[PDB]
Write a protein that binds this ligand. Sequence first.
Ligand SMILES: [Zn+2]
Ligand SMILES: [Zn+2]
Lengths: 81, 101, 140, 128, 142
Amino acid sequence: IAKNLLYPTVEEIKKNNKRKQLFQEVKGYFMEVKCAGCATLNVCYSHSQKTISCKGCSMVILRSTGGKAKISNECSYMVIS
Amino acid sequence: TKKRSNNGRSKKNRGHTRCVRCEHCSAMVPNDKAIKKFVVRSVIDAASLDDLKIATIYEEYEVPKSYYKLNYCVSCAVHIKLVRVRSRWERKIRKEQRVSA
Amino acid sequence: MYGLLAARNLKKNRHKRRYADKDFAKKARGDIYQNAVGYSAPHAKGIVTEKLGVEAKQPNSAIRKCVRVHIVRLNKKVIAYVPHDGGLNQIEINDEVIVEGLGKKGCRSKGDIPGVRFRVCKVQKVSLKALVTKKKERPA
Amino acid sequence: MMDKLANLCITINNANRAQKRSVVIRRISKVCRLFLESMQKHGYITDIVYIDDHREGKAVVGLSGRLNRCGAICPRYDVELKDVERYRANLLPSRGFGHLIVTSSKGLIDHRECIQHNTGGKILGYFY
Amino acid sequence: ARMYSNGKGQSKSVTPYNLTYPTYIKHSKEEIVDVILNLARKGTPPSQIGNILRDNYGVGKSFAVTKTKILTLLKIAGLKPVIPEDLNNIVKKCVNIKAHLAKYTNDKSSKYQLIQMQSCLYRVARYYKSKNELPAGWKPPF
RNA sequence: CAUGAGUAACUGGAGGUCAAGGCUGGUGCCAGCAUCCGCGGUAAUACCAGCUCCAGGAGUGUCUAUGAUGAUUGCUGCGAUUAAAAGGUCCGUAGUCGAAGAACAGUACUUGUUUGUAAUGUGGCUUAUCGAGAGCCGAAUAGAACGAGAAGAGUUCAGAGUAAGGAGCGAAGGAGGGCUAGAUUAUUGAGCAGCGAGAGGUGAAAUUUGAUGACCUGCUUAGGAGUAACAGAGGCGAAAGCGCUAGUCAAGAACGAAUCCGAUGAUCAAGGACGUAGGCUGGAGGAUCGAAGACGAUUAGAGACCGUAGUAGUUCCAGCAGUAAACGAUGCCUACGCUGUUGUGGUUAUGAGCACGGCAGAAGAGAAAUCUAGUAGGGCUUUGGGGAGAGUACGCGCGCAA
RNA sequence: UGAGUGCAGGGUUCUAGAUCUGAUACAAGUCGUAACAAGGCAGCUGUAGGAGAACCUGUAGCUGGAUCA
Ligand SMILES: [Zn+2]
Ligand SMILES: [Zn+2]
């Protein structure tokens, strides 16, 4: 065998389609987002199919789109899973 | 035997196209096959511009142009000598022609 | 049709294909018993009714000597060719002749003779080759 | 869908012609494993790894310089021990070398082992 | 390829390698099981149950916590529908096309779409009435 | 065993295939020969004879069926871009063909033992001078009885979830389709006003129209078609096909992603639905163009090509019909496969991908031209077998007819 | 149980027939010249009229075209 064929470089991994690999890769992940102002934390999915509003203050925190969802201008997040 | 790879026309990924009429003989020809010619002609001939300079009332004048797109069927284009017969290797060369006046 | 349990489909298809062969078709679906010499018999007896001549096909230039024969076994009348150099002189009207095939796959014309399909073999019970070359004489 | 044992053969035949030394084969079944394991016993292929991807399966293999050709037969004809030499003479290039593989109640075996064990079976494929 | 047309699309979503337990989440097992059965009684399809659980409550693929599948849980709770939800969505689209054609009779393209749709219904029916999921003499609403 | 003796070859051929003569005399496209190709018109190695050679030989020529020749019937093993040959497009029953993982069972499958073949045939040995011949031996096909093995095939399961299918979610794209309400010009026709002699048409002209005012320029109106330029080796649709602007009504394709169900699938006789144009049955309408018909020219003649004019049709609604060079002359699923460049729509670690394309080489392939044609016992349907007669006759099914 | 034979019909295969209409071969007859060169109006496929005869004319299509522009 060839090392190149049995163990691809991480560069090669990132260029391929998610299915066309030796082992298929998950692209979606979960995150904790915190609201500007009220500083409450909400669990969200990347690639969300639904618009989401902050607990309590009801500010729209996350907007659904054709691809990866859009966090509102002031808010911030961390990957949890 | 098959003479041209594109069957002599520009249709691909379509069933059917609009027809147009030949300028010289009014024959119907498909739009994607017709020979096309562009013209931009001054309303006034070059041999008169030196008289125009003394005839006009205005301080300066720009002559109006006239614009045309003409269409020809194969027989007319060959006969009027817009196109000519070419050798088996020349047939493949594609280049844009000049706009006429 | 190439599956392991496909034998029935395969057999019925391949049988139907064979009718495209002219040979198999004629044996199956044509009139193979219409002829004086053929599937039916190797030789045929008949009586001479008229003497006849025919032009050769182009580019040759000749008159070929032929005979009108009434065939005993079918009651058809047919044209036959008389092979040898002076052969026509060995035959009288109302003689009996035996007649033979020209040797093609179907009954077909041979050489330059248009539309004639048999040839004479014996006259009055004796070989025409012997008659012409004067090796034997007419029964009289 | 294509037959998995046919797919295996075309994948290695083309790669061999293109002078590659290794390939990945994308859909694998139980008899495909046993076929590859046969080619390893006779030294036609060198190294085998199997990937357990939960999506069918896939294999990575190293080719030797000794492999000229392989192929599957479809359908898988039943043969008596009397019949196998007919197929041997049809498929293989020489009486001296190469293998015709047959499935039997004793696993995959070659046309010589058929004589030793005294058994026919079903015809599967060949390599030389 | 596609069944009624010349399509060869490839858009799907990847199933994980292992499933674990979603420890990052903010509810118990029993709460998640309560959320499902509520959404069910309100009349939502089980594919929508899955979407909500992922989007709002933060659970992927809705099985890592429960060790049981959504439709099986609904049968355990007794909330099973009269017709499988796939066959049900095919009858709806047929009705819609017939209601359009009823007022716009001239539409040859809609006529074309109806005969395709109707074929798909009976192909699905014959599956279910073999697995004993429908009565043998069931017929479309038409 | 013993007596006499000295007898005993023909059939087909000799230009090529195909072994063996440009030998001598007759005949001059005659008479004849020749399976096929071909010989002969006065210098015939091919006819008719003489003489020498060749081949097989107690035998050799001919006719007729058949097996082989022949991969020109194709299971092994042919073809379908242009030589003969992929159904105009879909749906669909019978039929043929159908994941991974973990297990289970023995009727096919393969094999043992035992039955099942006189003659013929097969492997042998022994005796008629020899050789066929005769006599004796051994094993045997298909078919059946009882055991055995479990890879492939088959049946089941769910702490399993296809670059298999169907249902559903999110943001977006397109001359895809039906309906409602509007639009800028243009071509004809009428009304009225101005002007006062030609307009039209062609390679060149005549029919023809104009003082009842043409032509051209104004203002008014009435209709019925159409959507120029932008506009492309651009887009959409199952194909046929689809190009002005708004509003409205259903369904579909593709893309993103940790949604749901679980074999629901491929291809398809019979049966069913769509199908440019021209045509037919009934209604509406009728601007432009124009089969038929009628003239003017040109020609030996033009019935045609050109010009004047003119009807059915050309448009719409409700139906019938079922053909096209319905063509990329290349069936549908599913694979394995080199590089560079340019598009269209989404998505993006901004490195790239996925679907649908164009172009230019390479390597292989092929009779070449060229490449939807490379590699290959993957599955299923259609289809060809030297020219003609013939896609014709008779019968049958659909259609108002064609 | 039934041979034979009446009388109507059918199913098969052959054969007669005034007259009409195909095809094939016609050494070389009569009238034109439709195709193959831009063959003297570029050719061909479907459909509909017309015509001594090849064929001509309208409508949609194709290049196997005289143009890969
Ligand atoms: Zn907040
Ligand atoms: Zn023209």
